Amino acid sequence: RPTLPIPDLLTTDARNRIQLTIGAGQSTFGGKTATTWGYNGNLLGPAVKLQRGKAVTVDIYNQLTEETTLHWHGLEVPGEVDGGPQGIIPPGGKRSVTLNVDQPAATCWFHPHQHGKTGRQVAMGLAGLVVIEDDEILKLMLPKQWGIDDVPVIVQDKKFSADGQIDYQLDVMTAAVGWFGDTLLTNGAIYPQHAAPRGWLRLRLLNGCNARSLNFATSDNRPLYVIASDGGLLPEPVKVSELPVLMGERFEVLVEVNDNKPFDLVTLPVSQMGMAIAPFDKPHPVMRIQPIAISASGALPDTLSSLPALPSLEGLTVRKLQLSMDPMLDMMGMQMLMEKYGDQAMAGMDFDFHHANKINGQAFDMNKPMFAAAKGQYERWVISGVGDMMLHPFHIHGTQFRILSENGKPPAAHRAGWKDTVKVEGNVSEVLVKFNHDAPKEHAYMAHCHLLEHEDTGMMLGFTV
């Protein structure tokens, strides 16, 4: 196996600046070359490291021949630096943003948010990481050797043309069910291996797929200790045998490397339209873990953090957000899916498409924020997928929120801490959300489905603070 590539840990320079160059290059998948995009590279990006309470200025150089934006998914920052569809960086141009980090330690990420082209731009290779650190987390003695026992794991699927190029399309099928492929990448590589010291291994898992949900496990069924979610440390570790991860969600887990036998991190088949088509109809290797006898001292603490209590529900503003899809889109999309793949496309399951996906009866309008949310006050947002059968990992910019109910039930323990994404699929979810920073109509916050093709075809709204 190839060794697992490790995104460079990128810190501020002497003048508190960081440089990111967005550019086209070449990558190789199964010996066949593909044009790919990356941040400071051919593909994917670095891990930008940030400290709570410390400002940094990021200089962003768009070296593509098309417009793009740069969104910091998970970051509690004003709209002005949030990099939504309004944050155009012109081809060949430079834009600088100041990030004043004021949130708990977490693994966040960044990616484009170009109007109607987010799916393509992510599919082409653009994604990076954000490692936020604070006073508190460094006291825990968690594994911390970057790329040795503290390893990022960005898992993505791609579809390739016969000639080896990435095969991306926003068409009627993918507008309905999302863009998905038959090849799995782990930090850009096909089934790589990582050499992990005996003791404890920390994986910072990111589901960077456009539309594919994942469910992580190990090949020999050893447990995963979930220590962190989108927005940071849980109160204490949650021990699981498997870990579902929605598009754009991050979890950090520890895995015990307690002997010398190699094992795989795998993803288990999911029940989501399109996603159980072979070879994802069976458990699928993500990466091979090879135990090695080199120095490590990371540990699993009993107690990780203390989070605030859920706010009292009494008197909070409630906002309804009804997710919907044009029924003509669902029919045609599911029709083209069967025409392409056949029966397996429905395993586990019991006309201008460009504006067919909606929230509150409206496809995204960049010039029309849907509402003004309060600043510094909890609100209760109620997001409903009643009426359609698709999966909608619902993401809200400018915040880390608490899940009160997820798609019918109180959240699983490992999902009860800080989240920026909530599952919506045929039912209704509730979040307790607070915005610590402002966003004017000219640089509004987004709230949207993170199934990228849904977002690109209207399942997004803007809101101010």
Give the nearest distance from C-beta 385 to Cu ion in angstroms.
Answer: 8
Give the nearest distance from C-beta 184 to Cu ion in angstroms.
Answer: 22
- Asked if residue 115 belongs to a known ligand binding site, the reply is no
| Structural element, H or E, at residue 154 | strand 150-158
**Contact yes or no for 443/86 (Cβ under 8 A):** yes
Nearer to Cu ion, 304 or 451 (CB): 451
Give the nearest distance from C-beta 387 to Cu ion in angstroms.
Answer: 12
Which residues between 386 and 405 bind Cu ion (CB under 5 A)? 392, 397
Q: Is the dihedral of CA 71, 74, 78, 79 positive or negative?
A: positive
**Contact yes or no for 353/457 (Cβ under 8 A):** yes
Give the nearest distance from C-beta 448 to Cu ion in angstroms.
Answer: 8
Residue 17 CB coordination number (10 Å): 13
- DSSP class of residue 374? P
- Asked if residue 443 belongs to a known ligand binding site, the reply is no
Give the nearest distance from C-beta 358 to Cu ion in angstroms.
Answer: 10
β-bridge pairing 106-111 and 71-73: antiparallel
- Asked if residue 454 belongs to a known ligand binding site, the reply is yes
Residue 152 CB coordination number (10 Å): 27
- Asked if residue 113 belongs to a known ligand binding site, the reply is yes
User: How far, in Å, CA of 441 to CA of 88, rounded?
Assistant: 15
According to the binding rule CB under 5 A, does residue 111 interact with Cu ion?
Answer: no
CA 162 to chain CA centroid, Å, is: 28
- Asked if residue 111 belongs to a known ligand binding site, the reply is yes
**Contact yes or no for 372/423 (Cβ under 8 A):** no
Nearer to Cu ion, 253 or 451 (CB): 451
**Contact yes or no for 166/119 (Cβ under 8 A):** no
- Contact pattern for Cu ion over residues 413 through 452, marking x by CB under 5 A: ------------------------------------x-x-
- Asked if residue 395 belongs to a known ligand binding site, the reply is yes
Q: Which two tokens stand for residue 196?
A: 């992990």
Per CB under 5 A, the list member of 38, 43, 60, 73 interacting with Cu ion is 73
Nearer to Cu ion, 329 or 449 (CB): 449
- Asked if residue 354 belongs to a known ligand binding site, the reply is no
Nearer to Cu ion, 414 or 419 (CB): 419
According to the binding rule CB under 5 A, does residue 284 interact with Cu ion?
Answer: no
**Contact yes or no for 360/322 (Cβ under 8 A):** yes
- Asked if residue 209 belongs to a known ligand binding site, the reply is no
According to the binding rule CB under 5 A, does residue 454 interact with Cu ion?
Answer: yes
Annotated binding site for Cu cation: 71, 73, 111, 113, 392, 395, 397, 448-450, 454
Residues that bind Cu ion (CB under 5 A): 73, 392, 397, 449, 451, 454
